[PDB]
Amino acid sequence: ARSIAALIHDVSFDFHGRRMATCSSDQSVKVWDDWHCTASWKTHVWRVTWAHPEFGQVLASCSFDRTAAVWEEIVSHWVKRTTLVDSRTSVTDVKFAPKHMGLMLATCSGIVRIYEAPDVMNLSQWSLQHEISSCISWNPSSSRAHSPMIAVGSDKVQIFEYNENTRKYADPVHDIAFAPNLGRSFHILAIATKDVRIFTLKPHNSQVWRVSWNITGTVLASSGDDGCVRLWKANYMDNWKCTGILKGNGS
């Protein structure tokens, strides 16, 4: 529709949805906050997603140089307090863990370098508290009865849960997204593949791309090689159904 001024490899909102981080094809990431570019970085960026605001305005950039840069808020050209460059292979994506589980970032290169920062104020140190060896999805569950889970996609989804007893984590897939629960007793999984797939876990006709879940995890936006951002949603029978088609060019 409204083609605001901005090749953006990945564009993602923050928690409040008032600032947009876009990773250009020229190895640059910009915080496009009438979206006007309010920053310029030159990156070092396959995926750039924000962090939870209470943890600071941290943007995680996954590059092809076998590193996962994390640009931390220092007011504008944000200074990299930390640099998670310990990954042997290129970081496919960098998605922060939910705020309840602490400052954890996942870089599903296959080495899931789950870097944890014990000091919130001093995030310059990244500790690989866990390491399990295309898409990285985090479970937004914060329940006492729901253990934290980390999902890894391969270009085909495996969920690793940090079991309390052991205190340790235990068609090609393009992007995996977990819907926000909002007290649900089940999890809805959206996986980007040759065909869009939706699955329930209860305790385009082409190559799909980074599908995202809304703030409530009910209406779905699945994009693919067809060039049309099709909007999906549930139905009266609690089943996935098409809810609309949006044109990328704005028609």
């Binding site: 529709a1 953006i8 990945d10 947009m20 329940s143 949006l246 044109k247 060019n249």
Partner: protein, 689 residues
């Protein structure tokens, strides 16, 4: 092999080279349709076609015939039919007009004993202006865009870079066909041999920098993308998919046609157009389009990002994410004075019956919050009426409370439904009033309501006449037909009246299990006519019917107890409404039930959900409302130099530990962006942002 070639100008025109030339206009069905404008068949055995880059004259095709003669067919009248002929006849492989000088027409020919292959003609029979390359076969030609005169020619065994200034760097390799210099990167060249395509670097012209994937079938055409920042689409023989091996090297494929593809053509002007020609001349225009990086927003906006443009959908149904925004904007739920009007403040029959139920629980309080099912467990002293006696206090203390929760009787011990009837007539529900009046054993009042209703705003007159003939004889004519014909009535409340009348006394299953009648009326009816043994079994059946279905109207039966959490869990699972879940589970629920993990977590989502919508002040109202209902969920100023109504607040900066009176501090920070105290650089107001 048929070929498609976009014209340098006239962005709506293209020529599909075949056994006979044919110029189409983009208006067969290309997508859009193609209308033929001209057809030239006077140049048989054509093997090379190249557009005239100069504007005048337009549509000038240098058709390289199989005998070596280049015919400048017009698909400045001097440059029409020109028949440039080589010294010795042989195949003409490739033609390429120089972009810097569009009147040279570099021609590539096959082998010969002592005749030059790569002839640089002069558009101006003729003689070559430049003849470079002897005893070889120039398979491909590509003028370097930067230099005026440097044609990189693919000979039989080398990629010779012929310098027209001095008629030569050669790299002896097997990849010598289809040389195409990528426009944006003038130092990168492409060439394909059999099934492999190689990417070269003119600054390091010694070895191929990159050797792309070797497709099984041999490649037929490799062309760079003049629109993107480097996208070497690689056609393959007998392949319906264009392997767009992007050298930016992410590999992608596009299948625009169901049949094999002869040759494609990128549009120089159009943004990445992909005109595809099948051997059956099925000219289809496909479009590549960069991958869309969708990402929702809390306001439900899909920032579709295609290429370098951010197309924000901006919510271009009433989804639950969108629904809550309008609810919270109108202070939904928080208006806990007219609880029966909360659904009105909500802008749903389930929600309408839920808020009435919660209002009745609030009204009676001002064991009831345990729900109808727990209230009727201790109900004792139930009597069954064998015969319907047409005219309440005989009911138990639990039953009379249940009717109040169903709204049938007013607040108190008044054994009557008369005030309830008057409201229904005022509210306009005329068929419901007749049913409610009848259920209190009053035919005449039911007839009067229907007759009064039919008089205003005429079928209710006949229903009154039909209701007036209630005969209790087992084999009566009335019961024989009214029971059969009751199913053919529109309003459910009219149907249940005859269902209740014609049913054998004791088993009123024709009315107790009618889903089109409000649950409160059915439960109120059940409390009056069912015995304790039958009522408890029925309520347990109805409780579980709303328990699994996630019905808000089942809050009446389940109540705000452990079962109520289970029911409201199903409602959340079915729909996803935590805003309704948080408010309803906070209104009078007991501490033990409200201490459950699910209900506490339902609040945690909604507060976190309501934060993303920037409704902080609205959230502050919820926390204040929640705290009251849930007790278990609990220096000197730098300007005026005065030591420690909002202006008297003492602002302490978390960074530099400086600050003072709010009124003074805001005034200083209104026009300045530095800490007012001396020798301080901290921007206290701008730091938090």
């Amino acid at each position: 092999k048929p070929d498609i070639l976009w014209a340098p100008h006239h962005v709506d025109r293209f020529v599909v080279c075949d056994s006979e030339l044919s110029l189409y206009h983009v208006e067969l069905r290309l997508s859009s349709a193609a209308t033929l404008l001209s057809i030239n068949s006077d140049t048989p055995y054509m093997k090379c076609v190249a557009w005239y880059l100069n504007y005048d004259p337009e549509c000038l095709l240098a058709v390289g015939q199989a005998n070596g003669r280049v015919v400048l067919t017009s698909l400045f009248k001097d440059l029409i039919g020109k028949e440039f002929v080589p010294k010795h006849a042989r195949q003409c492989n490739t033609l390429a007009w120089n972009p810097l000088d569009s009147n040279w027409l570099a021609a590539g020919l096959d082998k010969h004993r002592a005749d030059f292959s790569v002839l640089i003609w002069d558009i101006c029979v003729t003689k070559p202006l430049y003849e470079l390359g002897q005893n070889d076969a120039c398979l491909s030609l590509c003028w370097l865009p930067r230099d005026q005169k440097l044609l990189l020619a693919g000979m039989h065994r080398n990629l010779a870079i012929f310098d027209l200034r001095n008629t030569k760097m050669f790299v002896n390799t097997k990849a010598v066909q289809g040389v195409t210099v990528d426009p944006y990167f003038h130092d990168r060249v492409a060439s394909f041999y059999e099934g492999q395509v190689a990417i070269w670097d003119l600054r390091k012209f010694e070895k191929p920098v990159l050797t792309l994937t070797e497709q099984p079938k041999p490649l037929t055409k490799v062309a760079w993308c003049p629109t993107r920042t480097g996208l070497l689409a690689t056609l393959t023989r007998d392949s319906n998919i264009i392997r767009l091996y992007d050298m930016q090297i992410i590999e992608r494929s596009v299948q625009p046609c169901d049949n094999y593809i002869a040759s494609f053509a990128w549009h120089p002007t159009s943004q990445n157009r992909m005109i595809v020609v099948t051997p059956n001349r099925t000219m289809s225009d496909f479009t590549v389009f960069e991958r869309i990086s969708l990402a929702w927003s809390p306001i439900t906006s899909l920032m579709w990002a295609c290429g370098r443009h951010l197309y924000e959908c901006t919510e271009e149904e009433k989804d639950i994410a969108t629904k809550m925004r309008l609810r919270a904007l109108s202070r939904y739920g928080l208006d806990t004075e007219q609880v029966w009007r909360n659904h009105i403040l909500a802008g749903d029959p389930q929600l309408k019956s839920l808020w009435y139920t919660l209002h009745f629980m609030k009204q009676y309080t001002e064991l009831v919050y345990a729900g109808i099912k727990s209230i009727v467990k201790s109900s004792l002293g139930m009597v069954e009426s064998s015969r319907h006696n047409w005219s309440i206090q005989n009911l138990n203390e639990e039953r009379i409370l249940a009717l109040q929760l169903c709204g049938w009787i007013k607040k108190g011990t008044d054994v009557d439904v008369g005030p309830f009837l008057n409201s229904l007539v005022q509210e306009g529900e005329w068929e419901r009033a007749a049913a409610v009046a009848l259920f209190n054993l009053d035919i005449r009042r039911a007839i009067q309501i229907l007759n009064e209703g039919a008089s205003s705003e005429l079928n209710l007159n006949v229903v009154a006449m039909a209701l007036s003939g209630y005969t209790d004889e087992k084999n009566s004519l009335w019961r024989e037909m009214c029971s059969t014909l009751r199913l053919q009535l529109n309003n459910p409340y009219l149907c249940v009246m005859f269902a209740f009348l014609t049913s054998e006394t004791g088993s009123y299953d024709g009315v107790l299990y009618e889903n089109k009648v409000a649950v409160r009326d059915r439960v109120a009816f059940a409390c009056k006519f069912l015995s304790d043994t039958q009522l408890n079994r029925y309520i347990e059946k109805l409780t579980n019917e709303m328990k699994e279905a996630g019905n808000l109207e089942g809050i009446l039966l389940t109540g705000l107890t452990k079962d109520g959490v289970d029911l409201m869990e199903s409602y959340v699972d079915r729909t996803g409404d935590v805003q309704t879940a948080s408010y309803c589970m906070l209104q009078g629920s007991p501490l033990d039930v409200l201490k459950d993990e699910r209900v506490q977590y339902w609040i945690e989502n909604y507060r976190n959900l309501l934060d993303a919508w920037r409704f902080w002040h609205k959230r502050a109202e919820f926390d204040i409302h929640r705290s009251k209902l849930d007790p278990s969920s609990k220096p000197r100023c730098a300007l005026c130099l005065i030591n420690m109504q909002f202006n008297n607040w003492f602002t302490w900066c978390h960074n530099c530990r400086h600050g003072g009176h709010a009124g003074h501090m805001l005034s200083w920070f209104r026009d300045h962006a530095e800490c007012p105290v001396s020798a301080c650089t901290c921007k206290c107001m701008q730091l938090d942002t």
